[PDB]
What does this fold into?
Amino acid sequence: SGFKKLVSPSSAVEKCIVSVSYRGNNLNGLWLGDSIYCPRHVLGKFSGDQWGDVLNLANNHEFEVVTQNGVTLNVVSRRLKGAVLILQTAVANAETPKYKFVKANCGDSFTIACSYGGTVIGLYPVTMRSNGTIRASFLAGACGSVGFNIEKGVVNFFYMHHLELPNALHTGTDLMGEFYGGYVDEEVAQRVPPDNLVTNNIVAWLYAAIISVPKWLESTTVSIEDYNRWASDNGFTPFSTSTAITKLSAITGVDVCKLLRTIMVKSAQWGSDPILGQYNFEDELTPESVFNQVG
Amino acid sequence: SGFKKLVSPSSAVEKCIVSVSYRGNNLNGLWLGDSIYCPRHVLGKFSGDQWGDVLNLANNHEFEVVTQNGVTLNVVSRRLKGAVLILQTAVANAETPKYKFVKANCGDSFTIACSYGGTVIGLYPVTMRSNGTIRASFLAGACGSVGFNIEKGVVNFFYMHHLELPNALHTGTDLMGEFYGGYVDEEVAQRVPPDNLVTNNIVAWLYAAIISVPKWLESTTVSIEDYNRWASDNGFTPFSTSTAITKLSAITGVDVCKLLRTIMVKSAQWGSDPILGQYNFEDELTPESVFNQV
Amino acid sequence: XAVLX
Amino acid sequence: XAVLX
It folds into this structure.
Protein backbone atom coordinates (compact mmCIF):
# COMPACT_ATOMS: atom_id res chain seq x y z
CA SER A 1 0.00 0.00 0.00
CA GLY A 2 1.61 3.16 -1.28
CA PHE A 3 4.23 2.54 -3.96
CA LYS A 4 7.94 3.30 -3.81
CA LYS A 5 11.06 2.46 -5.81
CA LEU A 6 12.77 0.27 -3.24
CA VAL A 7 16.47 -0.29 -2.79
CA SER A 8 17.96 -3.50 -1.39
CA PRO A 9 19.52 -3.36 2.11
CA SER A 10 23.31 -2.92 1.97
CA SER A 11 24.94 -4.73 4.91
CA ALA A 12 26.03 -7.82 2.96
CA VAL A 13 27.39 -5.82 0.04
CA GLU A 14 29.20 -3.21 2.17
CA LYS A 15 31.38 -6.00 3.58
CA CYS A 16 32.62 -6.74 0.05
CA ILE A 17 33.53 -3.25 -1.14
CA VAL A 18 37.20 -2.33 -1.00
CA SER A 19 39.51 0.39 -2.31
CA VAL A 20 41.93 -0.30 -5.17
CA SER A 21 44.99 1.83 -5.90
CA TYR A 22 47.46 1.74 -8.80
CA ARG A 23 50.11 4.43 -9.27
CA GLY A 24 47.97 7.17 -7.76
CA ASN A 25 44.90 5.77 -9.49
CA ASN A 26 41.99 5.28 -7.10
CA LEU A 27 38.61 3.61 -7.33
CA ASN A 28 36.42 0.85 -5.89
CA GLY A 29 36.59 -2.93 -6.03
CA LEU A 30 34.38 -5.94 -5.24
CA TRP A 31 35.87 -8.65 -3.01
CA LEU A 32 34.30 -12.12 -3.21
CA GLY A 33 36.19 -15.26 -2.22
CA ASP A 34 39.82 -14.52 -3.08
CA SER A 35 39.01 -12.38 -6.10
CA ILE A 36 38.84 -8.59 -6.35
CA TYR A 37 36.87 -7.15 -9.28
CA CYS A 38 37.42 -3.59 -10.51
CA PRO A 39 37.49 -1.51 -13.73
CA ARG A 40 40.55 -2.22 -15.88
CA HIS A 41 41.03 1.51 -16.57
CA VAL A 42 42.60 1.70 -13.09
CA LEU A 43 45.75 1.06 -15.12
CA GLY A 44 45.28 4.16 -17.28
CA LYS A 45 43.58 5.30 -20.49
CA PHE A 46 44.17 2.74 -23.24
CA SER A 47 42.40 1.15 -26.21
CA GLY A 48 42.03 -2.10 -28.11
CA ASP A 49 44.81 -4.64 -27.59
CA GLN A 50 46.84 -2.34 -25.34
CA TRP A 51 45.27 -3.73 -22.16
CA GLY A 52 46.84 -7.08 -21.28
CA ASP A 53 50.12 -5.93 -22.80
CA VAL A 54 50.00 -3.40 -19.96
CA LEU A 55 48.71 -5.91 -17.42
CA ASN A 56 51.52 -8.37 -18.20
CA LEU A 57 54.05 -5.60 -17.60
CA ALA A 58 52.52 -4.64 -14.26
CA ASN A 59 53.49 -6.00 -10.84
CA ASN A 60 51.19 -7.45 -8.19
CA HIS A 61 52.87 -5.48 -5.39
CA GLU A 62 51.78 -2.17 -6.91
CA PHE A 63 48.11 -2.96 -6.23
CA GLU A 64 47.09 -1.29 -2.99
CA VAL A 65 43.79 -2.82 -1.81
CA VAL A 66 42.28 -1.91 1.56
CA THR A 67 39.18 -3.25 3.29
CA GLN A 68 36.96 -1.32 5.69
CA ASN A 69 38.89 -2.56 8.71
CA GLY A 70 41.85 -0.77 7.22
CA VAL A 71 43.34 -4.16 6.38
CA THR A 72 45.68 -4.09 3.40
CA LEU A 73 45.25 -7.10 1.12
CA ASN A 74 48.14 -8.78 -0.67
CA VAL A 75 47.65 -9.48 -4.39
CA VAL A 76 49.02 -12.76 -5.76
CA SER A 77 47.86 -12.82 -9.42
CA ARG A 78 46.05 -10.78 -12.07
CA ARG A 79 43.96 -11.28 -15.20
CA LEU A 80 41.73 -9.33 -17.56
CA LYS A 81 38.17 -10.53 -18.06
CA GLY A 82 36.64 -8.29 -20.68
CA ALA A 83 37.02 -4.74 -19.38
CA VAL A 84 37.27 -6.02 -15.81
CA LEU A 85 40.49 -6.54 -13.87
CA ILE A 86 40.57 -9.45 -11.43
CA LEU A 87 43.19 -9.42 -8.68
CA GLN A 88 43.56 -12.59 -6.66
CA THR A 89 44.18 -12.00 -2.98
CA ALA A 90 46.30 -14.04 -0.59
CA VAL A 91 43.41 -14.15 1.88
CA ALA A 92 39.76 -14.88 1.05
CA ASN A 93 36.80 -12.74 2.12
CA ALA A 94 35.41 -14.74 5.04
CA GLU A 95 32.23 -12.71 4.69
CA THR A 96 31.47 -13.51 1.05
CA PRO A 97 27.68 -13.77 0.75
CA LYS A 98 25.83 -16.26 -1.46
CA TYR A 99 26.00 -14.42 -4.77
CA LYS A 100 25.54 -14.65 -8.52
CA PHE A 101 26.75 -12.64 -11.52
CA VAL A 102 23.72 -11.70 -13.61
CA LYS A 103 23.33 -9.67 -16.78
CA ALA A 104 20.54 -7.12 -16.51
CA ASN A 105 18.03 -7.01 -19.35
CA CYS A 106 16.39 -3.78 -20.48
CA GLY A 107 13.84 -2.80 -17.85
CA ASP A 108 15.55 -4.67 -14.99
CA SER A 109 16.04 -2.51 -11.89
CA PHE A 110 18.63 -2.88 -9.16
CA THR A 111 20.44 -1.00 -6.40
CA ILE A 112 23.54 1.09 -6.95
CA ALA A 113 25.95 1.10 -4.01
CA CYS A 114 27.41 4.56 -4.72
CA SER A 115 30.95 4.21 -3.43
CA TYR A 116 34.07 6.35 -2.97
CA GLY A 117 37.40 5.23 -1.56
CA GLY A 118 36.05 1.75 -0.87
CA THR A 119 33.15 3.16 1.16
CA VAL A 120 29.43 3.06 0.32
CA ILE A 121 28.13 6.58 0.99
CA GLY A 122 24.63 6.10 -0.33
CA LEU A 123 22.26 3.97 -2.38
CA TYR A 124 19.63 4.52 -5.05
CA PRO A 125 17.70 2.48 -7.58
CA VAL A 126 18.40 2.46 -11.31
CA THR A 127 16.93 0.69 -14.33
CA MET A 128 18.88 -0.78 -17.25
CA ARG A 129 17.83 1.35 -20.23
CA SER A 130 17.21 0.09 -23.77
CA ASN A 131 20.44 1.71 -24.96
CA GLY A 132 22.55 -0.07 -22.35
CA THR A 133 22.92 2.85 -19.95
CA ILE A 134 21.56 3.76 -16.53
CA ARG A 135 20.46 7.16 -15.27
CA ALA A 136 22.54 7.33 -12.11
CA SER A 137 24.57 9.73 -9.97
CA PHE A 138 28.36 9.38 -10.02
CA LEU A 139 31.28 11.76 -9.49
CA ALA A 140 35.03 11.29 -9.96
CA GLY A 141 36.27 8.31 -7.96
CA ALA A 142 32.97 6.40 -8.08
CA CYS A 143 34.20 3.91 -10.68
CA GLY A 144 33.89 0.31 -9.62
CA SER A 145 30.68 1.02 -7.68
CA VAL A 146 28.37 -1.99 -8.02
CA GLY A 147 24.75 -2.56 -8.95
CA PHE A 148 22.88 -5.38 -7.24
CA ASN A 149 19.74 -6.73 -5.64
CA ILE A 150 18.88 -9.36 -3.05
CA GLU A 151 16.51 -12.15 -4.05
CA LYS A 152 15.77 -15.25 -1.97
CA GLY A 153 18.89 -14.93 0.16
CA VAL A 154 21.23 -14.45 -2.79
CA VAL A 155 22.99 -11.23 -3.77
CA ASN A 156 22.75 -10.60 -7.50
CA PHE A 157 25.52 -8.43 -8.98
CA PHE A 158 24.47 -6.95 -12.33
CA TYR A 159 26.78 -3.99 -12.78
CA MET A 160 30.13 -2.27 -12.17
CA HIS A 161 30.44 1.41 -13.00
CA HIS A 162 32.95 2.47 -15.67
CA LEU A 163 32.09 5.72 -17.41
CA GLU A 164 29.84 8.71 -18.04
CA LEU A 165 28.33 9.39 -21.45
CA PRO A 166 27.05 12.83 -22.54
CA ASN A 167 23.80 14.04 -20.92
CA ALA A 168 24.25 12.50 -17.46
CA LEU A 169 24.21 8.92 -18.74
CA HIS A 170 26.22 6.17 -17.09
CA THR A 171 27.30 2.72 -18.21
CA GLY A 172 29.60 -0.11 -17.29
CA THR A 173 29.97 -3.88 -17.41
CA ASP A 174 28.29 -6.87 -15.83
CA LEU A 175 30.56 -8.80 -13.47
CA MET A 176 31.63 -10.97 -16.41
CA GLY A 177 33.50 -8.03 -17.93
CA GLU A 178 31.14 -7.30 -20.83
CA PHE A 179 30.05 -3.70 -21.45
CA TYR A 180 26.31 -3.04 -21.51
CA GLY A 181 25.11 -1.53 -24.79
CA GLY A 182 28.42 -2.35 -26.44
CA TYR A 183 30.21 0.76 -25.21
CA VAL A 184 33.96 0.83 -24.61
CA ASP A 185 36.02 2.15 -21.72
CA GLU A 186 37.45 4.99 -23.82
CA GLU A 187 36.96 8.75 -23.76
CA VAL A 188 35.71 9.22 -27.31
CA ALA A 189 32.46 10.07 -29.08
CA GLN A 190 30.23 6.97 -28.90
CA ARG A 191 26.77 6.73 -30.45
CA VAL A 192 24.06 6.21 -27.86
CA PRO A 193 20.93 4.55 -29.30
CA PRO A 194 17.59 6.23 -28.49
CA ASP A 195 16.29 5.51 -24.98
CA ASN A 196 12.92 3.74 -25.14
CA LEU A 197 10.38 4.08 -22.36
CA VAL A 198 10.07 0.64 -20.74
CA THR A 199 6.59 -0.62 -21.53
CA ASN A 200 6.64 -3.45 -18.98
CA ASN A 201 7.39 -1.06 -16.12
CA ILE A 202 4.87 1.50 -17.38
CA VAL A 203 2.31 -1.30 -17.29
CA ALA A 204 3.38 -2.08 -13.71
CA TRP A 205 3.02 1.58 -12.79
CA LEU A 206 -0.46 1.69 -14.35
CA TYR A 207 -1.57 -1.37 -12.37
CA ALA A 208 -0.21 0.25 -9.21
CA ALA A 209 -2.22 3.36 -10.07
CA ILE A 210 -5.31 1.18 -10.57
CA ILE A 211 -4.71 -0.89 -7.44
CA SER A 212 -4.39 2.33 -5.42
CA VAL A 213 -7.70 3.69 -6.77
CA PRO A 214 -9.65 5.24 -13.28
CA LYS A 215 -11.02 7.83 -15.68
CA TRP A 216 -7.75 7.74 -17.60
CA LEU A 217 -8.05 3.99 -18.22
CA GLU A 218 -8.99 3.01 -21.78
CA SER A 219 -11.83 0.55 -22.38
CA THR A 220 -10.73 -0.48 -25.87
CA THR A 221 -7.84 -2.91 -26.18
CA VAL A 222 -4.92 -3.24 -28.55
CA SER A 223 -3.17 -6.54 -29.24
CA ILE A 224 0.38 -7.31 -28.08
CA GLU A 225 1.49 -7.90 -31.68
CA ASP A 226 0.07 -4.53 -32.77
CA TYR A 227 1.23 -2.61 -29.72
CA ASN A 228 4.76 -3.82 -30.39
CA ARG A 229 4.42 -2.79 -34.04
CA TRP A 230 3.35 0.65 -32.83
CA ALA A 231 5.97 0.67 -30.06
CA SER A 232 8.69 0.25 -32.69
CA ASP A 233 7.81 3.61 -34.26
CA ASN A 234 7.04 5.60 -31.12
CA GLY A 235 9.97 5.14 -28.74
CA PHE A 236 8.81 2.30 -26.47
CA THR A 237 10.31 -1.11 -25.78
CA PRO A 238 8.22 -4.11 -26.80
CA PHE A 239 5.82 -5.61 -24.29
CA SER A 240 6.68 -9.11 -23.09
CA THR A 241 4.67 -11.21 -20.67
CA SER A 242 5.87 -11.86 -17.12
CA THR A 243 4.51 -13.88 -14.21
CA ALA A 244 4.36 -10.64 -12.20
CA ILE A 245 2.33 -8.78 -14.84
CA THR A 246 0.07 -11.86 -15.04
CA LYS A 247 -0.46 -11.72 -11.28
CA LEU A 248 -1.11 -7.98 -11.44
CA SER A 249 -3.59 -8.57 -14.25
CA ALA A 250 -5.30 -11.25 -12.15
CA ILE A 251 -5.35 -9.03 -9.06
CA THR A 252 -7.02 -6.07 -10.77
CA GLY A 253 -9.07 -7.99 -13.33
CA VAL A 254 -7.90 -5.40 -15.85
CA ASP A 255 -6.78 -6.68 -19.26
CA VAL A 256 -3.14 -5.78 -19.92
CA CYS A 257 -4.26 -4.87 -23.45
CA LYS A 258 -6.26 -1.93 -22.09
CA LEU A 259 -3.15 -0.62 -20.35
CA LEU A 260 -1.26 -0.92 -23.62
CA ARG A 261 -4.01 1.01 -25.41
CA THR A 262 -3.88 3.56 -22.57
CA ILE A 263 -0.16 3.97 -23.18
CA MET A 264 -0.81 4.62 -26.87
CA VAL A 265 -3.34 7.37 -26.18
CA LYS A 266 -1.63 9.09 -23.25
CA SER A 267 1.56 8.99 -25.31
CA ALA A 268 0.09 11.04 -28.16
CA GLN A 269 -1.68 13.54 -25.90
CA TRP A 270 -1.56 13.13 -22.12
CA GLY A 271 -4.31 15.63 -21.44
CA SER A 272 -5.03 17.24 -18.08
CA ASP A 273 -5.76 14.01 -16.19
CA PRO A 274 -2.75 13.08 -14.06
CA ILE A 275 -1.80 9.52 -13.15
CA LEU A 276 -0.48 9.24 -9.60
CA GLY A 277 0.17 12.99 -9.73
CA GLN A 278 2.17 12.90 -12.97
CA TYR A 279 1.77 13.92 -16.60
CA ASN A 280 4.56 11.65 -17.84
CA PHE A 281 5.15 7.90 -17.62
CA GLU A 282 7.10 6.38 -14.77
CA ASP A 283 9.02 3.44 -16.23
CA GLU A 284 11.50 2.57 -13.49
CA LEU A 285 9.01 0.78 -11.23
CA THR A 286 8.93 -2.93 -12.15
CA PRO A 287 6.11 -5.53 -12.18
CA GLU A 288 8.03 -7.53 -9.56
CA SER A 289 8.32 -4.49 -7.28
CA VAL A 290 4.65 -3.48 -7.58
CA PHE A 291 3.55 -7.07 -6.90
CA ASN A 292 5.80 -7.18 -3.84
CA GLN A 293 4.10 -4.04 -2.54
CA VAL A 294 0.54 -5.37 -2.71
CA GLY A 295 1.17 -8.48 -0.66
CA SER B 1 26.54 13.71 -13.33
CA GLY B 2 22.93 12.80 -12.57
CA PHE B 3 20.62 13.63 -9.66
CA LYS B 4 19.00 10.91 -7.57
CA LYS B 5 17.18 10.68 -4.23
CA LEU B 6 19.67 8.74 -2.17
CA VAL B 7 19.05 6.40 0.72
CA SER B 8 21.53 5.94 3.57
CA PRO B 9 23.52 2.70 3.67
CA SER B 10 21.86 0.37 6.19
CA SER B 11 24.63 -1.70 7.75
CA ALA B 12 24.51 0.12 11.09
CA VAL B 13 20.72 0.17 11.39
CA GLU B 14 20.24 -3.51 10.43
CA LYS B 15 22.10 -4.67 13.56
CA CYS B 16 19.57 -2.82 15.74
CA ILE B 17 16.32 -4.13 14.28
CA VAL B 18 14.56 -6.79 16.34
CA SER B 19 11.29 -8.72 16.42
CA VAL B 20 8.83 -7.87 19.21
CA SER B 21 5.71 -9.93 20.01
CA TYR B 22 3.06 -9.65 22.73
CA ARG B 23 -0.08 -11.80 22.92
CA GLY B 24 0.04 -12.63 19.23
CA ASN B 25 0.83 -9.09 18.12
CA ASN B 26 4.20 -9.00 16.36
CA LEU B 27 6.05 -6.03 14.94
CA ASN B 28 9.50 -4.44 14.74
CA GLY B 29 11.64 -2.96 17.51
CA LEU B 30 14.75 -0.76 17.71
CA TRP B 31 17.52 -2.21 19.92
CA LEU B 32 20.01 0.35 21.25
CA GLY B 33 22.11 -0.25 24.36
CA ASP B 34 19.85 -2.12 26.78
CA SER B 35 16.62 -0.64 25.44
CA ILE B 36 14.14 -1.77 22.81
CA TYR B 37 11.78 0.81 21.29
CA CYS B 38 8.54 -0.13 19.47
CA PRO B 39 4.95 1.10 18.96
CA ARG B 40 2.80 0.82 22.08
CA HIS B 41 -0.07 -0.61 20.00
CA VAL B 42 1.86 -3.89 20.19
CA LEU B 43 -0.18 -4.13 23.41
CA GLY B 44 -3.49 -4.05 21.55
CA LYS B 45 -5.95 -1.47 20.18
CA PHE B 46 -6.62 0.94 23.05
CA SER B 47 -7.09 4.68 23.57
CA GLY B 48 -6.72 7.60 25.97
CA ASP B 49 -5.41 6.51 29.38
CA GLN B 50 -6.01 2.82 28.83
CA TRP B 51 -2.42 2.34 27.66
CA GLY B 52 -0.81 2.91 31.05
CA ASP B 53 -3.26 0.63 32.83
CA VAL B 54 -2.81 -2.13 30.25
CA LEU B 55 0.97 -1.95 30.58
CA ASN B 56 0.70 -2.04 34.37
CA LEU B 57 -1.21 -5.33 34.14
CA ALA B 58 1.26 -6.86 31.66
CA ASN B 59 4.17 -9.16 32.54
CA ASN B 60 7.73 -8.65 31.30
CA HIS B 61 7.94 -12.30 30.26
CA GLU B 62 4.92 -11.86 27.96
CA PHE B 63 7.11 -9.72 25.69
CA GLU B 64 8.97 -11.89 23.18
CA VAL B 65 12.01 -10.09 21.80
CA VAL B 66 14.08 -11.90 19.19
CA THR B 67 17.20 -10.80 17.34
CA GLN B 68 17.91 -11.63 13.72
CA ASN B 69 20.37 -14.23 15.03
CA GLY B 70 17.49 -16.03 16.73
CA VAL B 71 18.42 -14.99 20.26
CA THR B 72 15.58 -14.24 22.68
CA LEU B 73 16.15 -11.14 24.83
CA ASN B 74 14.53 -11.37 28.27
CA VAL B 75 12.70 -8.17 29.28
CA VAL B 76 13.48 -6.80 32.78
CA SER B 77 11.35 -3.63 32.79
CA ARG B 78 8.77 -1.79 30.70
CA ARG B 79 7.45 1.77 30.40
CA LEU B 80 5.64 4.12 28.04
CA LYS B 81 7.08 7.32 26.57
CA GLY B 82 4.37 8.94 24.48
CA ALA B 83 3.08 6.29 22.06
CA VAL B 84 6.31 4.30 22.22
CA LEU B 85 6.91 1.29 24.44
CA ILE B 86 10.43 0.98 25.84
CA LEU B 87 11.47 -2.45 27.07
CA GLN B 88 14.71 -2.82 28.97
CA THR B 89 16.74 -5.96 28.46
CA ALA B 90 19.41 -7.56 30.64
CA VAL B 91 21.60 -7.96 27.56
CA ALA B 92 22.87 -4.93 25.68
CA ASN B 93 23.30 -4.55 21.95
CA ALA B 94 27.08 -4.66 21.65
CA GLU B 95 26.73 -3.25 18.15
CA THR B 96 24.92 -0.03 19.09
CA PRO B 97 26.13 2.79 16.80
CA LYS B 98 26.61 6.43 17.76
CA TYR B 99 23.09 7.78 17.34
CA LYS B 100 20.71 10.59 18.17
CA PHE B 101 16.90 10.93 18.32
CA VAL B 102 15.90 13.88 16.15
CA LYS B 103 12.50 15.29 15.23
CA ALA B 104 12.05 15.76 11.49
CA ASN B 105 10.84 19.16 10.30
CA CYS B 106 8.68 19.68 7.21
CA GLY B 107 10.77 19.05 4.11
CA ASP B 108 13.40 16.99 5.93
CA SER B 109 14.21 13.85 3.98
CA PHE B 110 15.29 10.53 5.50
CA THR B 111 15.52 6.80 4.87
CA ILE B 112 12.86 4.26 5.81
CA ALA B 113 14.12 0.78 6.74
CA CYS B 114 11.05 -1.18 5.65
CA SER B 115 10.95 -4.07 8.11
CA TYR B 116 8.97 -7.26 8.65
CA GLY B 117 9.40 -9.77 11.46
CA GLY B 118 12.47 -7.92 12.70
CA THR B 119 14.30 -7.95 9.37
CA VAL B 120 14.96 -5.05 6.99
CA ILE B 121 13.68 -6.12 3.57
CA GLY B 122 14.29 -2.90 1.66
CA LEU B 123 14.92 0.84 1.89
CA TYR B 124 13.55 4.02 0.32
CA PRO B 125 13.60 7.79 0.84
CA VAL B 126 10.74 9.84 2.27
CA THR B 127 10.13 13.46 3.22
CA MET B 128 8.25 14.73 6.27
CA ARG B 129 5.23 16.51 4.77
CA SER B 130 3.75 19.72 6.17
CA ASN B 131 0.84 17.75 7.66
CA GLY B 132 2.99 15.32 9.65
CA THR B 133 2.71 12.38 7.28
CA ILE B 134 5.07 10.68 4.85
CA ARG B 135 4.24 8.99 1.57
CA ALA B 136 5.73 5.55 2.13
CA SER B 137 5.13 1.86 1.37
CA PHE B 138 4.00 -0.30 4.31
CA LEU B 139 1.90 -3.46 4.69
CA ALA B 140 0.54 -5.34 7.69
CA GLY B 141 3.50 -6.26 9.88
CA ALA B 142 5.62 -3.19 9.08
CA CYS B 143 4.85 -1.24 12.25
CA GLY B 144 7.97 -0.21 14.18
CA SER B 145 9.93 0.30 10.94
CA VAL B 146 12.33 3.20 11.45
CA GLY B 147 13.29 6.29 9.47
CA PHE B 148 16.87 7.55 9.70
CA ASN B 149 19.89 9.07 8.00
CA ILE B 150 23.60 9.18 8.75
CA GLU B 151 25.47 12.43 9.19
CA LYS B 152 29.07 12.76 10.35
CA GLY B 153 29.27 9.19 11.62
CA VAL B 154 26.09 9.45 13.69
CA VAL B 155 22.84 7.62 13.04
CA ASN B 156 19.96 10.05 13.39
CA PHE B 157 16.64 8.32 14.15
CA PHE B 158 13.70 10.45 13.07
CA TYR B 159 10.77 8.08 12.83
CA MET B 160 9.01 4.89 13.89
CA HIS B 161 6.00 3.70 11.85
CA HIS B 162 2.58 3.33 13.50
CA LEU B 163 -0.33 3.76 11.08
CA GLU B 164 -1.85 4.28 7.67
CA LEU B 165 -4.27 7.11 6.98
CA PRO B 166 -6.64 7.29 3.95
CA ASN B 167 -5.10 7.97 0.51
CA ALA B 168 -1.94 5.93 1.17
CA LEU B 169 -0.56 8.29 3.80
CA HIS B 170 1.62 7.06 6.64
CA THR B 171 2.53 8.43 10.03
CA GLY B 172 4.10 7.56 13.34
CA THR B 173 6.27 9.01 16.08
CA ASP B 174 9.81 10.22 16.59
CA LEU B 175 11.88 7.99 18.87
CA MET B 176 10.69 10.05 21.84
CA GLY B 177 7.17 8.64 21.37
CA GLU B 178 5.67 11.87 20.10
CA PHE B 179 3.35 11.58 17.07
CA TYR B 180 4.04 13.68 13.97
CA GLY B 181 1.11 15.81 12.80
CA GLY B 182 -0.62 15.25 16.13
CA TYR B 183 -2.22 11.96 15.07
CA VAL B 184 -3.03 9.09 17.45
CA ASP B 185 -2.51 5.34 17.43
CA GLU B 186 -6.22 4.51 17.19
CA GLU B 187 -8.25 3.14 14.28
CA VAL B 188 -10.71 6.05 14.11
CA ALA B 189 -11.23 8.85 11.57
CA GLN B 190 -8.55 11.53 11.76
CA ARG B 191 -8.32 14.89 10.03
CA VAL B 192 -5.30 15.41 7.78
CA PRO B 193 -4.47 19.04 6.91
CA PRO B 194 -3.73 19.78 3.22
CA ASP B 195 -0.27 18.82 1.98
CA ASN B 196 1.82 21.89 1.07
CA LEU B 197 4.46 21.46 -1.64
CA VAL B 198 7.92 22.10 -0.12
CA THR B 199 9.42 25.25 -1.62
CA ASN B 200 13.00 24.72 -0.44
CA ASN B 201 13.11 21.28 -2.04
CA ILE B 202 11.47 22.53 -5.26
CA VAL B 203 14.14 25.25 -5.43
CA ALA B 204 16.83 22.57 -4.93
CA TRP B 205 15.31 20.59 -7.81
CA LEU B 206 15.16 23.60 -10.15
CA TYR B 207 18.84 24.28 -9.35
CA ALA B 208 19.50 20.65 -10.23
CA ALA B 209 17.63 21.19 -13.51
CA ILE B 210 19.83 24.24 -14.21
CA ILE B 211 23.08 22.42 -13.36
CA SER B 212 22.30 19.32 -15.46
CA VAL B 213 22.17 21.48 -18.59
CA PRO B 214 16.52 27.12 -19.67
CA LYS B 215 13.38 28.37 -21.41
CA TRP B 216 11.31 27.86 -18.25
CA LEU B 217 13.61 29.91 -15.99
CA GLU B 218 11.75 33.17 -15.34
CA SER B 219 13.82 36.31 -15.91
CA THR B 220 12.19 38.42 -13.20
CA THR B 221 12.68 38.12 -9.47
CA VAL B 222 9.97 38.05 -6.83
CA SER B 223 10.97 39.04 -3.30
CA ILE B 224 11.10 36.31 -0.69
CA GLU B 225 8.58 38.39 1.28
CA ASP B 226 6.08 38.46 -1.56
CA TYR B 227 6.59 34.80 -2.47
CA ASN B 228 6.04 33.78 1.16
CA ARG B 229 3.01 36.05 1.29
CA TRP B 230 1.82 34.22 -1.86
CA ALA B 231 2.85 30.74 -0.69
CA SER B 232 0.73 30.98 2.47
CA ASP B 233 -2.31 31.28 0.20
CA ASN B 234 -1.43 28.78 -2.54
CA GLY B 235 -0.42 25.59 -0.73
CA PHE B 236 3.33 26.08 -0.51
CA THR B 237 5.61 26.15 2.51
CA PRO B 238 7.53 29.37 3.15
CA PHE B 239 10.96 29.74 1.58
CA SER B 240 13.61 29.77 4.31
CA THR B 241 17.32 30.48 3.97
CA SER B 242 19.73 27.56 3.93
CA THR B 243 23.45 27.17 3.26
CA ALA B 244 23.00 24.46 0.61
CA ILE B 245 20.61 26.71 -1.35
CA THR B 246 23.07 29.62 -1.10
CA LYS B 247 25.84 27.43 -2.51
CA LEU B 248 23.60 26.24 -5.36
CA SER B 249 22.75 29.86 -6.10
CA ALA B 250 26.50 30.57 -6.09
CA ILE B 251 27.31 27.65 -8.40
CA THR B 252 24.74 28.68 -11.03
CA GLY B 253 24.86 32.44 -10.57
CA VAL B 254 21.05 32.43 -10.49
CA ASP B 255 19.19 34.31 -7.73
CA VAL B 256 16.76 32.12 -5.77
CA CYS B 257 14.16 34.87 -6.23
CA LYS B 258 13.99 33.91 -9.91
CA LEU B 259 13.29 30.29 -9.01
CA LEU B 260 10.59 31.53 -6.65
CA ARG B 261 9.10 33.51 -9.53
CA THR B 262 9.33 30.37 -11.66
CA ILE B 263 7.38 28.44 -9.02
CA MET B 264 4.56 31.03 -8.90
CA VAL B 265 4.30 31.21 -12.69
CA LYS B 266 4.29 27.47 -13.33
CA SER B 267 2.07 26.89 -10.29
CA ALA B 268 -0.64 28.90 -12.03
CA GLN B 269 0.03 27.30 -15.40
CA TRP B 270 2.83 24.91 -16.38
CA GLY B 271 2.01 24.66 -20.03
CA SER B 272 4.73 22.88 -21.52
CA ASP B 273 8.17 22.60 -21.47
CA PRO B 274 8.87 20.07 -19.04
CA ILE B 275 11.47 20.44 -16.30
CA LEU B 276 13.66 17.36 -16.04
CA GLY B 277 11.07 15.29 -17.91
CA GLN B 278 7.99 16.19 -15.86
CA TYR B 279 5.12 18.64 -15.64
CA ASN B 280 4.87 18.66 -11.88
CA PHE B 281 7.20 19.92 -9.15
CA GLU B 282 9.55 17.42 -7.52
CA ASP B 283 9.24 18.05 -3.79
CA GLU B 284 11.46 15.49 -2.12
CA LEU B 285 14.96 16.23 -3.41
CA THR B 286 16.63 18.38 -0.74
CA PRO B 287 19.09 21.28 -1.19
CA GLU B 288 21.70 19.23 0.69
CA SER B 289 21.26 16.17 -1.52
CA VAL B 290 21.46 18.21 -4.71
CA PHE B 291 24.57 20.05 -3.52
CA ASN B 292 26.16 16.75 -2.46
CA GLN B 293 25.76 15.44 -6.00
CA VAL B 294 27.47 18.40 -7.67
CA UNK C 1 -10.45 5.40 9.12
CA ALA C 2 -6.85 4.86 10.25
CA VAL C 3 -5.26 1.39 10.18
CA LEU C 4 -2.64 0.35 12.62
CA UNK C 5 0.18 -1.34 10.75
CA UNK D 1 32.89 12.54 -25.57
CA ALA D 2 32.64 9.78 -22.91
CA VAL D 3 34.52 10.24 -19.55
CA LEU D 4 35.90 7.53 -17.27
CA UNK D 5 34.80 7.96 -13.68
Remarks:
- Chains C and A do not touch (no CB pair under 8 Å).
- Chain C is about 0% helix and 40% strand.
- The longest strand of chain C covers residues 3-4.
